[PDB]
C-alpha cells in the first residue's frame with residue numbers, strides 16, 4: 001500500500017495520499033460571506049487528511065456566484081479563516097485554500113450593485129447557481145447572462161488573484177489552489193465554447209491560456225511557486241463548458257506551461273458528477289512526463305483505483321469529495337478497511353450542522 005505513505009507537496013509534507021477535495025457547502029454567514037465556527041469544526045474533524053483543500057473561496061466580491069460561499073478578500077474573512085487554519089494546525093493537519101472567480105456562473109442579485117456578472121464573452125452559462133431565499137435556505141436560480149470583460153479590466157482580475165493569495169498567506173493556509181476548472185472564470189477563458197474573444201485572450205490555445213498563466217505567474221511572484229497548486233478539468237464537458245475539439249493537445253500545452261513555473265501541484269478533475277469517458281493510461285503518461293510536481297487525481301475514485309494509479313507512477317495522491325463529506329476520518333477508515341457512513345446528499349449544500357458536522361468518526 002502507498003496511500004498511507006508521505007508525499008512532499010511543495011512547501012509541506014503530507015503524511016498520506018488521501019486528500020480532501022474542494023467541496024462547496026454554502027454555509028457561510030451573509031452579509032459578508034464570512035467563514036463560521038461551524039465551518040472551523042468541520043475542517044478540524046477532517047484534519048487527518050493528507051491535505052485538506054477548502055471549498056471554493058472568492059478572490060473578490062465580484063467573484064461571487066453562490067450564496068453562502070466564503071470570500072478571502074475582506075478583513076473579517078481573513079480573521080475568520082485565521083481561526084479555521086489554526087484549528088487544522090492544532091490537529092497537525094495541512095490546508096490549502098481553493099480560490100475562484102465564478103465568472104458567468106453567477107447571478108446579478110449577488111453581484112456588486114446587482115449588475116451582470118463578468119466573463120470572457122457575453123454568453124449565458126445556461127445553467128443554475130444556488131442562491132438563498134428569505135429564510136436563508138438554498139434555492140436554484142438560472143444564471144444571468146454575463147458582460148464580456150474589457151481588455152483593460154483583465155489586469156484587475158490578475159491583481160485580485162494576487163491579492164487573495166497574499167491574504168491566504170496571512171490567513172495561515174499552507175498552500176493555495178487556483179480554480180481553473182468546472183466552467184468558472186479561468187476555464188471560461190480556456191474553452192473555445194465560452195471564449196469568443198478576438199483580442200489576445202481568445203482564439204489560439206496560447207491566447208486562451210494567457211489569463212490563467214498570467215495568474216500563475218502573479219501568484220508565484222507574490223508568495224512562492226512551492227505554495228501554488230492548480231485545479232483543471234481539461235478533458236470532457238463541465239457545466240456546459242467543453243474543452244473543445246483539440247482538448248488533449250490543448251491540455252498538454254497548458255500542462256507544459258504550468259511545469260515551467262515549478263508549482264507545487266497539478267490537480268486534475270477527471271469527470272464531472274454526471275460522468276465522462278475515463279482517462280487513458282497513455283494520456284496519463286503524457287501528463288506525467290510534462291509535469292514534475294505532484295499530480296492529484298479526482299473523480300469517483302476508489303481507494304483501489306488510487307492505489308493502482310499511484311503504484312503505476314501516474315499520479316501521487318487522490319482527492320475524495322463525497323466520501324470526505326460523509327467520513328471525517330476517511331483516512332483511518334480506508335486504512336482499516338472499515339465501512340463508510342452513508343451519504344445524505346440533500347444536505348450537501350446549505351443548511352447547518354445537520355449533514356455537515358454530524359457524520360461520526362469511528
Ligand SMILES: Cc1cc2nc3c(=O)[nH]c(=O)nc-3n(C[C@H](O)[C@H](O)[C@H](O)COP(=O)(O)O)c2cc1C
Nearest residue numbers: 021022023024055056298299300301320321322348
Ligand atoms: C457538494 C459538492 C461540492 C463541490 N464543490 C467543489 C468546489 O468547491 N470546487 C471544486 O473544484 N470542485 C468541487 N466539487 C467537485 C469535487 O471536488 C470532487 O472533484 C468530486 O466530488 C468528484 O469526486 P468524488 O466522487 O470523490 O466525490 C464539489 C462536489 C460536490 C459533490
